[PDB]
Amino acid sequence: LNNIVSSLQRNGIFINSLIAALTIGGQQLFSSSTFSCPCQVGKNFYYGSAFLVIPALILLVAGFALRSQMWTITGEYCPLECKLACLRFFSITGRAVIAPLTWLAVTLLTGTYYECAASEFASVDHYPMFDNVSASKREEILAGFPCCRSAPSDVILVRDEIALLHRYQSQMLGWILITLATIAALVSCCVAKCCSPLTSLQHCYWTSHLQNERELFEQAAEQHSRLLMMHRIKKLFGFIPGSEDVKHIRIPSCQDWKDISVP
Amino acid sequence: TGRAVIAPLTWLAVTLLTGTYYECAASEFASVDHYPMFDNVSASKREEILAGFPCCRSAPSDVILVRDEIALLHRYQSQMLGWILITLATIAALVSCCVAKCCSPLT
Amino acid sequence: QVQLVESGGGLVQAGGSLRLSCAASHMRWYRQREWVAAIYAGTHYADSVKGRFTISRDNAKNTVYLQMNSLKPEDTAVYYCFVYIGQGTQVTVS
DSSP states (O other): OHHHHHHHHHOHHHHHHHHHHHHHHHHHHHHHHSOOOOOOSSSSHHHHHHHHHHHHHHHHHHHHHSOTHHHHHHHHHOOHHHHHHHHHHHHHHHHHHHHHHHHHHHHHHHOHHHHHHSGGGOOOSSSSSOOOTTSSHHHHHHHHTTTTOOOOSSHHHHHHHHHHHHHHHHHHHHHHHHHHHHHHHHHHHHHHTTTOOSOHHHHHHHHHHHHHHHHHHHHHHHHHHHHHHHHHHHHHTSSOTTSOOSSOOOOOOTTHHHHTTOO | OHHHHHHHHHHHHHHHHHOHHHHHHSGGGOOOSSSSSOOOTTSSHHHHHHHHTTTTOOOOSSHHHHHHHHHHHHHHHHHHHHHHHHHHHHHHHHHHHHHHTTTOOOO | OOOEEEESOOEEOTTOEEEEEEEEOOEEEEEOOEEEEEEOOOEEEOSTTTTTEEEEEETTTTEEEEEEESOOGGGOEEEEEEOOBOOOEEEEEO
8 A cells, every 4th residue: 555655755746735735835825824925115126025035045955955966967067968968857857946936926815925025016196086296105104004904095996906907916926926926837848848859758768767766775885884894893893693693703902993984 | 073063053053043142242233323313312221212112121112113124134134144154155055066076086 | 401391281071172292401201100102204193092182283383282182080190291301281171
C-alpha cells in the first residue's frame, strides 16, 4: 500500500499539486494572521508591493536552490552535453517556479494585497467630493479608508466603489498572469520537444537511468566506505567486528590510536 | 553552521514579523517634533508619556490615535527589517553555497 | 518672567454658562489632574466632555479664553492651565 503512495509521489503532477495546495494554505494563514494593512499615508504602496514580491522571490529562490542537481548543472556550466543540461534545467525550473506563480495568482485573486497596495494611486479627480484645496488631506484619507477606517462621512460608498475598481483590476491581473504563464509553458514545452535530440521515450528512460545510477552509486559508495572501515578495524584490532571475536585480539597500545586518526 | 544558525534566524524573523518586541523596544526613540500636540516645555514628561502609552497605558487624552499612528509606524518598520533580514539571509545562503560549490575539490 | 493667572471662574448652577480667562505674559488646559483642551491653530477636546466646551485665544491681548456651556455638577473640579504650571481655580456646579 505504501508502495502505491511512493509511486504517486514519483508522479510530478501530484507533487506540484501538493506544493500548490500547501502554498495556498500558507498564504491564506499568513493573510488572516499577520497582514494588518498598515494605513500610513506616506509609504503604504511599499508595504503591499513588498508583500506581493518578496514572498514570491524567496519562494522562487528556495525552489531553485532546494534541487541539488542544479548545483552540478552550474558546476558543469562554470554538443549533446549542452542540450542535456538545458533540458534538465528547464525540467527543474518548472517545479522551481510553480510555487511563486501559485503565490502570485492566489494573492491577486484574493485581492487584499493589491487593495492595500495601490490604494493611494487611485484617481479621484473624477469624483467631485474630493476637492481638498489643501491637496494633502486627500491623499491622507485615500490611504486611510482602505485599511480599517470606515470614516462614515458619505465617503464610504465612494471608497467601496474605489475598492471595487481596484479589486476588479486585481482579478484581471491574476488571470492575465495565469494566461501568460500557461502560454509560456506551452512554448517552453515546444522547445523541450523541438530542440531535444532524444526521442520522447528516450528522455524518460534516460532520466530513470540517471536516477537509478545515482542511487546505486550512492549505495555502492556507502558500502565501500563500510568495507574500508571494516578492513581498517580488522587490520588494527586483528578481528572482524560482528563476527566470532573469540579467536584473537590485538590489545593495541597507546601508539596504535594515532594511526587510525589519519582519516 | 547552516543548521547552527537556522534557528536564531527563525527567532529574529518571527519576532520582527510579530513586531511586539520592536514595538516596546524603540518606542521612546520615536520622533514627536513633527506632532504639534507634544510641546512639553518641561521636555521630560514627553519622554515619560512616550514610553508610557505603548505598553498597556491607553491614557484616553486624544493622544491614543497619535500613539496608534506611532505604533503603526514602528510596526511597519519592524516588518521591513524582518523581511530585509530575510532577504539578506537568503542572499548569504546563495553565496555561501557558491563557495561550497566553488572551493570544494570533491565532486 | 511668564506669569499665568486663572480668572473668570466661580459658582454656577445647572444649565448656566461660564467663561474662563487667563493672562499670559500654544496653550493647554488642566482640571482636577485631567486634560481639557489644546490650542496653538489646531484645537482638540476631551471625549468625556465632547460637545460642551470651546477654547479660543488671541495674541493681541496675549490671553486665552475657554467657554463652558450648560455646566452640570458632574464636572466639579479645580481648573488649571499649562503652556510652568498655573495657580489654578476651583469651580463647583450645583
